[PDB]
Amino acid sequence: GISRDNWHKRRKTGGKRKPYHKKRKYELGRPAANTKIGPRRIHTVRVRGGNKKYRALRLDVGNFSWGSECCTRKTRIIDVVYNASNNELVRTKTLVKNCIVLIDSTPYRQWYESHYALPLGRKKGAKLTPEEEEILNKKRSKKIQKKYDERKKNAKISSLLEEQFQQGKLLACIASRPGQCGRADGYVLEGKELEFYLRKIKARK
Amino acid sequence: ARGPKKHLKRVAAPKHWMLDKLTGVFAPRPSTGPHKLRECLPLIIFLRNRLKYALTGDEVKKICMQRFIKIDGKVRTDITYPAGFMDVISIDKTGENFRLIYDTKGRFAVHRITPEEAKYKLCKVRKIFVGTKGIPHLVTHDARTIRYPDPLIKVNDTIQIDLETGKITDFIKFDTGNLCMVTGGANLGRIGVITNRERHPGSFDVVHVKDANGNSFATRLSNIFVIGKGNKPWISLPRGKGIRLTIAEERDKRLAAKQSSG
Amino acid sequence: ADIQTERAYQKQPTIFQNKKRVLLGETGKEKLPRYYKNIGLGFKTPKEAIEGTYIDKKCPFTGNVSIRGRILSGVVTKMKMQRTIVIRRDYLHYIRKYNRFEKRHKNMSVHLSPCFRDVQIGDIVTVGECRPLSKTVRFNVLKVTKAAGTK
Amino acid sequence: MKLNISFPATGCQKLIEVDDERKLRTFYEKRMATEVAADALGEEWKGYVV
RNA sequence: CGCUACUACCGAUUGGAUGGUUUAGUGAGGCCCUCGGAUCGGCCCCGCCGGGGUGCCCUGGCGGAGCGCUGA
RNA sequence: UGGUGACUCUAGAUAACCUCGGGCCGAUCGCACGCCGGCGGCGACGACCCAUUCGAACGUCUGCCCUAUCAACUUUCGAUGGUAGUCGCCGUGCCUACCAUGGUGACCACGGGUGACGGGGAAUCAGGGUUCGAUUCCGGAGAGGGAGCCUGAGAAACGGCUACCACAUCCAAGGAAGGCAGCAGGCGCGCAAAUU
RNA sequence: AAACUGCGAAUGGCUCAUUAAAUCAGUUAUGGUUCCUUUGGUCGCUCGUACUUGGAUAACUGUGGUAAUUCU
Ligand SMILES: [Mg+2]
Ligand SMILES: [Mg+2]
Ligand SMILES: [Mg+2]
Ligand SMILES: [Mg+2]
Ligand SMILES: [Mg+2]
Ligand SMILES: [Mg+2]
Ligand SMILES: [Mg+2]
Ligand SMILES: [Mg+2]
Ligand SMILES: [Mg+2]
Ligand SMILES: [Mg+2]
Ligand SMILES: [Mg+2]
Ligand SMILES: [Mg+2]
Ligand SMILES: [Mg+2]
Ligand SMILES: [Mg+2]
Ligand SMILES: [Mg+2]
Ligand SMILES: [Mg+2]
Ligand SMILES: [Mg+2]
Ligand SMILES: [Mg+2]
Ligand SMILES: [Mg+2]
Ligand SMILES: [Mg+2]
Ligand SMILES: [Mg+2]
Ligand SMILES: [Mg+2]
Ligand SMILES: [Mg+2]
Ligand SMILES: [Mg+2]
Ligand SMILES: [Mg+2]
């Protein structure tokens, strides 16, 4: 079927190569897993050696890491906004490695508000319904309050991430291969990489 | 050829088996095991061709199925079991013990050992790796992995294994001045003191070895097996004490034996 | 020298560049740490690779490649591809019927790192074997020595 | 068109030879695993479902 | 120049026969994907219920029906 | 912690994840029987992972016959390289998207031919050579010709399957079944080769 | 006996059509992969009816269909 052999190719001198054997099983290839965004659908592939490849066809949840805070959470994949290889991949919303994706920011905001006791991504209406007023102010002993005040001194987020948190969606890069492991994991974009991809996305539209 | 090969042509068998040409087309084809195919002695070859305890392969099978043969203290009923260097073969029914030691001409000699010496063996260490919550592990040339080895034990060293328990009792470090046997190449079977080891990074390391008669020879590092600490071996050596006679002195010795005979 | 010229973001994968920094330690930029490795076999790491900013995943000093096997030498003949050059190896092949040699050559496409600048047509390059980097490239330039009459 | 009729309760089976198309028109155009009232087969088949 | 034979060439014939490469179109069959859902179950519901506690439900074993809920 | 010439190695710490087409964490068999009310000796099967053996698969370097009445070839449908990915057991234009215009050649490229499977080897030979190598060992390829697959650790397997092409068997004409370049043996071809 | 399960059937044997840096040979590499089996290690390391769980199916017994198959 699909082949990955090097002998059907021309020689470096440009001459044709005449095949000396027919297609072998160990040179096979398989159709691409154009993973989409949707309710989870994963198929398994029996591969060489009897092992197993997980072929993700639809995914809607990933495991993404906030590196600057070392906060890894399972979030919901929302949309595909950039692909460095092809534009049709963005047009068809295909999850591949190194694709830029919008992920839900709720778990990260929850962790931030529970770890720093400072609001994140909030509007100025200051609703602060109960069980959030408690998580943000609470009452603590002197030692606990002192520890939180010590934390607050080095809790400052970059403005770009703050804007994204206001919108409720963060930009992330997929570092996994959904068509091989059945998982869409990655890291939240920040720093100069975030600026680069923001400029690229704006210039694309 | 799809899949692994299961036969061995007689003329394609390793030459140190000393197999003839007219007995058959095939050779015993050693089973997969602790020793490589080219560097092993199958049980059938030893039990039939060497010791003459059996006349045919079926007799070797009949011998082994009564559970008389033990290789390193464990009963082995596979007639093509690969027994290799420093292995101990015990037959309790007749009460003898052999150690597979290379002869001077690169062949496994029939070397009988005392039952006291059949309780241990020497193993070259092939690699050391840490795994599974920082537990060190040793791998020997006999494909046995030993966890919690002495931290001094490094690669290319020799460890004395108690066959009954499988634990290390002592070791010899690979260093100049230690006695060694050559387990491969042109000098296979030769015994001598290590003189110098020259390192070639990214390539093979060459070890120089001097005999007890003053002769010197080189080998690759992978062909060196530390036998003893200093000049004294930790095992018993075969009748030829590891020194190689030239064809001239071999002929002279044979002629002297002929003259003294009768 | 801008190093972002592709659709994707170029970055050394081992280095983490988003470590949190307090404003008290914001003296310009943090001077992004550089990943580099010492390839063995007595080859020195060029100072350019250590103090550079180029991104080259095929670089023997800052990329993911292992030097192993054969180490060869050649003369640079062409430098018209991106980050890879064509060198020439000349030798004499013996013919036993006549007891005489004949001059032969073969070209080799070898990857050249951005750490070797001012490479001219004619200098000697010591290259080392690595894993396949492209269809025809299996070697990486490890050392550059100038021609006999350079300025 | 022979009929191979089995009664699981007793384990007994019988091969009947029905050559009348009027009787067999009950089973026509019916798919497998469909329960049909076997009445046209005979008077003794009254109340039987196959 | 004349007599006989052979070989070879050019070959008008717009030669054929066989084979091998391709342009364009058609395209069996497998494989993958998106559907499809003939049938077979399980839970549930009852007529049916064996007994425990006690008519009293926690489990047997049936029949009927539910595009009920799910699985293959 | 340990290692290598060289790891982005090994081990460690942390935050999470962990596929319904699921990963391990024993619902298995036999023989002796025992001791102190529960504990048990030999084995056999099974099992994730690591190592080992048997390999296999891609690569590195050098090496092949004739032919110029084959001198330029490859690149629009990958040719050479770069970036990101897809697929694959993995490294790779292996394939895709976007880039760059490269890559080989009188040191014979490219194309054509071979009564070309390649070696270990064989005949002849003072010395140098010439010719042969289908043929029992090693490696490769194929199972009438192509192609596509299932199962499996391992086939693109043909004494497995599915098609098309060429042949061809039985048939109640609706259908069914094929593959001796295995051992014998028959036909045909031939100057040319053995017993069902 | 049969049948289910497991293993093998990818070795061996044959032939030389294809194949011209291809195959192959010597030399190296996998720090770039897979590996049934044999051998050794690991297998209370995990803080969450068991003195043993469920549904089938073959062999077998009986009704068959087709001119015909290692069909069913
Ligand atoms: Mg496996
Ligand atoms: Mg074979
Ligand atoms: Mg090495
Ligand atoms: Mg077409
Ligand atoms: Mg199709
Ligand atoms: Mg890539
Ligand atoms: Mg590329
Ligand atoms: Mg393209
Ligand atoms: Mg031929
Ligand atoms: Mg030849
Ligand atoms: Mg031949
Ligand atoms: Mg021929
Ligand atoms: Mg052969
Ligand atoms: Mg084949
Ligand atoms: Mg034929
Ligand atoms: Mg086939
Ligand atoms: Mg056949
Ligand atoms: Mg076969
Ligand atoms: Mg025949
Ligand atoms: Mg004839
Ligand atoms: Mg003859
Ligand atoms: Mg069976
Ligand atoms: Mg087996
Ligand atoms: Mg099998
Ligand atoms: Mg084991």
PDB file of N, CA and C in Angstrom, chain B residues 53-111:
ATOM      1  N   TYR B  53      30.310 -40.331  25.859  1.00  0.00           N
ATOM      2  CA  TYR B  53      29.321 -41.009  26.686  1.00  0.00           C
ATOM      3  C   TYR B  53      28.147 -41.504  25.864  1.00  0.00           C
ATOM      4  N   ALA B  54      27.901 -40.892  24.714  1.00  0.00           N
ATOM      5  CA  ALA B  54      26.816 -41.276  23.831  1.00  0.00           C
ATOM      6  C   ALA B  54      27.355 -41.429  22.419  1.00  0.00           C
ATOM      7  N   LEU B  55      26.718 -42.305  21.649  1.00  0.00           N
ATOM      8  CA  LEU B  55      27.149 -42.568  20.284  1.00  0.00           C
ATOM      9  C   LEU B  55      26.329 -41.825  19.246  1.00  0.00           C
ATOM     10  N   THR B  56      25.083 -41.495  19.558  1.00  0.00           N
ATOM     11  CA  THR B  56      24.196 -40.798  18.645  1.00  0.00           C
ATOM     12  C   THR B  56      23.477 -39.693  19.401  1.00  0.00           C
ATOM     13  N   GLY B  57      22.751 -38.860  18.657  1.00  0.00           N
ATOM     14  CA  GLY B  57      21.986 -37.801  19.288  1.00  0.00           C
ATOM     15  C   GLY B  57      20.873 -38.317  20.174  1.00  0.00           C
ATOM     16  N   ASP B  58      20.235 -39.419  19.771  1.00  0.00           N
ATOM     17  CA  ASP B  58      19.161 -39.993  20.574  1.00  0.00           C
ATOM     18  C   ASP B  58      19.674 -40.453  21.930  1.00  0.00           C
ATOM     19  N   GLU B  59      20.895 -40.981  21.977  1.00  0.00           N
ATOM     20  CA  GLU B  59      21.474 -41.358  23.259  1.00  0.00           C
ATOM     21  C   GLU B  59      21.743 -40.135  24.127  1.00  0.00           C
ATOM     22  N   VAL B  60      22.157 -39.020  23.520  1.00  0.00           N
ATOM     23  CA  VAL B  60      22.336 -37.788  24.284  1.00  0.00           C
ATOM     24  C   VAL B  60      21.009 -37.334  24.869  1.00  0.00           C
ATOM     25  N   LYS B  61      19.937 -37.423  24.080  1.00  0.00           N
ATOM     26  CA  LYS B  61      18.620 -37.066  24.597  1.00  0.00           C
ATOM     27  C   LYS B  61      18.216 -37.981  25.745  1.00  0.00           C
ATOM     28  N   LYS B  62      18.486 -39.280  25.613  1.00  0.00           N
ATOM     29  CA  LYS B  62      18.170 -40.216  26.687  1.00  0.00           C
ATOM     30  C   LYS B  62      18.956 -39.895  27.948  1.00  0.00           C
ATOM     31  N   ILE B  63      20.211 -39.478  27.796  1.00  0.00           N
ATOM     32  CA  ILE B  63      21.007 -39.092  28.955  1.00  0.00           C
ATOM     33  C   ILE B  63      20.415 -37.862  29.622  1.00  0.00           C
ATOM     34  N   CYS B  64      20.085 -36.842  28.830  1.00  0.00           N
ATOM     35  CA  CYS B  64      19.661 -35.577  29.417  1.00  0.00           C
ATOM     36  C   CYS B  64      18.267 -35.662  30.022  1.00  0.00           C
ATOM     37  N   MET B  65      17.412 -36.551  29.517  1.00  0.00           N
ATOM     38  CA  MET B  65      16.056 -36.624  30.046  1.00  0.00           C
ATOM     39  C   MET B  65      15.957 -37.364  31.373  1.00  0.00           C
ATOM     40  N   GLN B  66      17.025 -38.010  31.832  1.00  0.00           N
ATOM     41  CA  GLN B  66      17.069 -38.522  33.195  1.00  0.00           C
ATOM     42  C   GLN B  66      17.595 -37.491  34.179  1.00  0.00           C
ATOM     43  N   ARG B  67      17.823 -36.259  33.726  1.00  0.00           N
ATOM     44  CA  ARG B  67      18.224 -35.147  34.585  1.00  0.00           C
ATOM     45  C   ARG B  67      19.544 -35.429  35.299  1.00  0.00           C
ATOM     46  N   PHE B  68      20.540 -35.868  34.532  1.00  0.00           N
ATOM     47  CA  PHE B  68      21.869 -36.125  35.071  1.00  0.00           C
ATOM     48  C   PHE B  68      22.832 -34.968  34.861  1.00  0.00           C
ATOM     49  N   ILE B  69      22.600 -34.144  33.848  1.00  0.00           N
ATOM     50  CA  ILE B  69      23.528 -33.075  33.501  1.00  0.00           C
ATOM     51  C   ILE B  69      23.100 -31.797  34.204  1.00  0.00           C
ATOM     52  N   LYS B  70      24.042 -31.137  34.872  1.00  0.00           N
ATOM     53  CA  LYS B  70      23.794 -29.843  35.486  1.00  0.00           C
ATOM     54  C   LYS B  70      24.783 -28.839  34.922  1.00  0.00           C
ATOM     55  N   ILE B  71      24.288 -27.688  34.490  1.00  0.00           N
ATOM     56  CA  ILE B  71      25.136 -26.620  33.980  1.00  0.00           C
ATOM     57  C   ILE B  71      25.038 -25.459  34.958  1.00  0.00           C
ATOM     58  N   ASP B  72      26.150 -25.164  35.626  1.00  0.00           N
ATOM     59  CA  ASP B  72      26.213 -24.160  36.684  1.00  0.00           C
ATOM     60  C   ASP B  72      25.189 -24.440  37.779  1.00  0.00           C
ATOM     61  N   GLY B  73      25.086 -25.710  38.154  1.00  0.00           N
ATOM     62  CA  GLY B  73      24.273 -26.104  39.282  1.00  0.00           C
ATOM     63  C   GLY B  73      22.799 -26.285  39.008  1.00  0.00           C
ATOM     64  N   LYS B  74      22.354 -26.132  37.766  1.00  0.00           N
ATOM     65  CA  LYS B  74      20.949 -26.290  37.424  1.00  0.00           C
ATOM     66  C   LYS B  74      20.791 -27.358  36.355  1.00  0.00           C
ATOM     67  N   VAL B  75      19.783 -28.212  36.526  1.00  0.00           N
ATOM     68  CA  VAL B  75      19.555 -29.310  35.596  1.00  0.00           C
ATOM     69  C   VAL B  75      19.099 -28.757  34.256  1.00  0.00           C
ATOM     70  N   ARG B  76      19.783 -29.163  33.191  1.00  0.00           N
ATOM     71  CA  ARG B  76      19.498 -28.702  31.838  1.00  0.00           C
ATOM     72  C   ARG B  76      19.154 -29.909  30.978  1.00  0.00           C
ATOM     73  N   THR B  77      17.904 -29.986  30.531  1.00  0.00           N
ATOM     74  CA  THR B  77      17.450 -31.089  29.695  1.00  0.00           C
ATOM     75  C   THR B  77      17.457 -30.755  28.211  1.00  0.00           C
ATOM     76  N   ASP B  78      17.915 -29.568  27.833  1.00  0.00           N
ATOM     77  CA  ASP B  78      17.994 -29.170  26.433  1.00  0.00           C
ATOM     78  C   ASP B  78      19.332 -29.631  25.871  1.00  0.00           C
ATOM     79  N   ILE B  79      19.289 -30.452  24.818  1.00  0.00           N
ATOM     80  CA  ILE B  79      20.517 -31.038  24.302  1.00  0.00           C
ATOM     81  C   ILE B  79      21.318 -30.048  23.471  1.00  0.00           C
ATOM     82  N   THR B  80      20.707 -28.956  23.020  1.00  0.00           N
ATOM     83  CA  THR B  80      21.411 -27.916  22.283  1.00  0.00           C
ATOM     84  C   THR B  80      21.645 -26.682  23.143  1.00  0.00           C
ATOM     85  N   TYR B  81      21.682 -26.863  24.454  1.00  0.00           N
ATOM     86  CA  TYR B  81      21.883 -25.739  25.352  1.00  0.00           C
ATOM     87  C   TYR B  81      23.279 -25.168  25.153  1.00  0.00           C
ATOM     88  N   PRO B  82      23.416 -23.868  24.972  1.00  0.00           N
ATOM     89  CA  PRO B  82      24.747 -23.295  24.764  1.00  0.00           C
ATOM     90  C   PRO B  82      25.531 -23.149  26.055  1.00  0.00           C
ATOM     91  N   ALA B  83      26.520 -24.006  26.256  1.00  0.00           N
ATOM     92  CA  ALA B  83      27.424 -23.896  27.390  1.00  0.00           C
ATOM     93  C   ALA B  83      28.706 -23.235  26.905  1.00  0.00           C
ATOM     94  N   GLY B  84      29.116 -22.170  27.579  1.00  0.00           N
ATOM     95  CA  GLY B  84      30.234 -21.390  27.100  1.00  0.00           C
ATOM     96  C   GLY B  84      31.365 -21.256  28.089  1.00  0.00           C
ATOM     97  N   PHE B  85      32.095 -20.150  28.000  1.00  0.00           N
ATOM     98  CA  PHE B  85      33.309 -19.985  28.783  1.00  0.00           C
ATOM     99  C   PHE B  85      33.006 -19.955  30.276  1.00  0.00           C
ATOM    100  N   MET B  86      33.848 -20.644  31.043  1.00  0.00           N
ATOM    101  CA  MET B  86      33.823 -20.741  32.500  1.00  0.00           C
ATOM    102  C   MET B  86      32.607 -21.475  33.041  1.00  0.00           C
ATOM    103  N   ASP B  87      31.772 -22.047  32.183  1.00  0.00           N
ATOM    104  CA  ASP B  87      30.635 -22.815  32.662  1.00  0.00           C
ATOM    105  C   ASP B  87      31.113 -24.081  33.360  1.00  0.00           C
ATOM    106  N   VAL B  88      30.331 -24.531  34.335  1.00  0.00           N
ATOM    107  CA  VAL B  88      30.637 -25.732  35.104  1.00  0.00           C
ATOM    108  C   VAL B  88      29.586 -26.779  34.775  1.00  0.00           C
ATOM    109  N   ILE B  89      30.032 -27.927  34.278  1.00  0.00           N
ATOM    110  CA  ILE B  89      29.154 -29.039  33.934  1.00  0.00           C
ATOM    111  C   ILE B  89      29.382 -30.148  34.949  1.00  0.00           C
ATOM    112  N   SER B  90      28.336 -30.495  35.686  1.00  0.00           N
ATOM    113  CA  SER B  90      28.410 -31.484  36.749  1.00  0.00           C
ATOM    114  C   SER B  90      27.551 -32.685  36.392  1.00  0.00           C
ATOM    115  N   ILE B  91      28.135 -33.873  36.513  1.00  0.00           N
ATOM    116  CA  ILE B  91      27.418 -35.130  36.361  1.00  0.00           C
ATOM    117  C   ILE B  91      27.588 -35.872  37.679  1.00  0.00           C
ATOM    118  N   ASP B  92      26.534 -35.873  38.496  1.00  0.00           N
ATOM    119  CA  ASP B  92      26.611 -36.480  39.819  1.00  0.00           C
ATOM    120  C   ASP B  92      26.526 -37.997  39.757  1.00  0.00           C
ATOM    121  N   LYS B  93      25.805 -38.541  38.774  1.00  0.00           N
ATOM    122  CA  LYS B  93      25.643 -39.988  38.693  1.00  0.00           C
ATOM    123  C   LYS B  93      26.987 -40.682  38.538  1.00  0.00           C
ATOM    124  N   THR B  94      27.842 -40.161  37.664  1.00  0.00           N
ATOM    125  CA  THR B  94      29.213 -40.630  37.559  1.00  0.00           C
ATOM    126  C   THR B  94      30.181 -39.816  38.401  1.00  0.00           C
ATOM    127  N   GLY B  95      29.766 -38.647  38.877  1.00  0.00           N
ATOM    128  CA  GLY B  95      30.534 -37.919  39.864  1.00  0.00           C
ATOM    129  C   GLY B  95      31.703 -37.114  39.353  1.00  0.00           C
ATOM    130  N   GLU B  96      31.600 -36.496  38.180  1.00  0.00           N
ATOM    131  CA  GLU B  96      32.668 -35.616  37.729  1.00  0.00           C
ATOM    132  C   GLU B  96      32.159 -34.209  37.450  1.00  0.00           C
ATOM    133  N   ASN B  97      33.103 -33.273  37.418  1.00  0.00           N
ATOM    134  CA  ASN B  97      32.829 -31.870  37.160  1.00  0.00           C
ATOM    135  C   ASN B  97      33.841 -31.351  36.156  1.00  0.00           C
ATOM    136  N   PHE B  98      33.357 -30.617  35.164  1.00  0.00           N
ATOM    137  CA  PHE B  98      34.188 -30.020  34.137  1.00  0.00           C
ATOM    138  C   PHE B  98      33.982 -28.515  34.138  1.00  0.00           C
ATOM    139  N   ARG B  99      35.017 -27.789  33.743  1.00  0.00           N
ATOM    140  CA  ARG B  99      34.918 -26.361  33.489  1.00  0.00           C
ATOM    141  C   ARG B  99      35.308 -26.109  32.044  1.00  0.00           C
ATOM    142  N   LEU B 100      34.448 -25.411  31.312  1.00  0.00           N
ATOM    143  CA  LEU B 100      34.706 -25.115  29.907  1.00  0.00           C
ATOM    144  C   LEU B 100      35.747 -24.012  29.834  1.00  0.00           C
ATOM    145  N   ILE B 101      36.993 -24.401  29.589  1.00  0.00           N
ATOM    146  CA  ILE B 101      38.115 -23.480  29.490  1.00  0.00           C
ATOM    147  C   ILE B 101      38.753 -23.664  28.124  1.00  0.00           C
ATOM    148  N   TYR B 102      39.011 -22.556  27.440  1.00  0.00           N
ATOM    149  CA  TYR B 102      39.638 -22.622  26.129  1.00  0.00           C
ATOM    150  C   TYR B 102      41.021 -23.243  26.230  1.00  0.00           C
ATOM    151  N   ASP B 103      41.325 -24.135  25.297  1.00  0.00           N
ATOM    152  CA  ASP B 103      42.668 -24.665  25.187  1.00  0.00           C
ATOM    153  C   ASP B 103      43.554 -23.683  24.428  1.00  0.00           C
ATOM    154  N   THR B 104      44.841 -24.014  24.347  1.00  0.00           N
ATOM    155  CA  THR B 104      45.791 -23.127  23.691  1.00  0.00           C
ATOM    156  C   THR B 104      45.471 -22.947  22.215  1.00  0.00           C
ATOM    157  N   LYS B 105      44.882 -23.961  21.582  1.00  0.00           N
ATOM    158  CA  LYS B 105      44.519 -23.898  20.173  1.00  0.00           C
ATOM    159  C   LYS B 105      43.078 -23.469  19.957  1.00  0.00           C
ATOM    160  N   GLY B 106      42.503 -22.733  20.901  1.00  0.00           N
ATOM    161  CA  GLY B 106      41.189 -22.145  20.725  1.00  0.00           C
ATOM    162  C   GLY B 106      40.044 -23.127  20.637  1.00  0.00           C
ATOM    163  N   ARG B 107      40.055 -24.164  21.465  1.00  0.00           N
ATOM    164  CA  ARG B 107      38.984 -25.143  21.509  1.00  0.00           C
ATOM    165  C   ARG B 107      38.659 -25.455  22.958  1.00  0.00           C
ATOM    166  N   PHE B 108      37.388 -25.737  23.222  1.00  0.00           N
ATOM    167  CA  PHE B 108      36.969 -26.088  24.572  1.00  0.00           C
ATOM    168  C   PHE B 108      37.550 -27.446  24.931  1.00  0.00           C
ATOM    169  N   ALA B 109      38.464 -27.462  25.890  1.00  0.00           N
ATOM    170  CA  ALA B 109      39.101 -28.691  26.324  1.00  0.00           C
ATOM    171  C   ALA B 109      38.248 -29.393  27.369  1.00  0.00           C
ATOM    172  N   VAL B 110      38.364 -30.716  27.413  1.00  0.00           N
ATOM    173  CA  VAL B 110      37.768 -31.484  28.496  1.00  0.00           C
ATOM    174  C   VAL B 110      38.661 -31.301  29.712  1.00  0.00           C
ATOM    175  N   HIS B 111      38.210 -30.494  30.663  1.00  0.00           N
ATOM    176  CA  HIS B 111      39.016 -30.106  31.816  1.00  0.00           C
ATOM    177  C   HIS B 111      38.266 -30.491  33.083  1.00  0.00           C
TER     178      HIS B 111
END
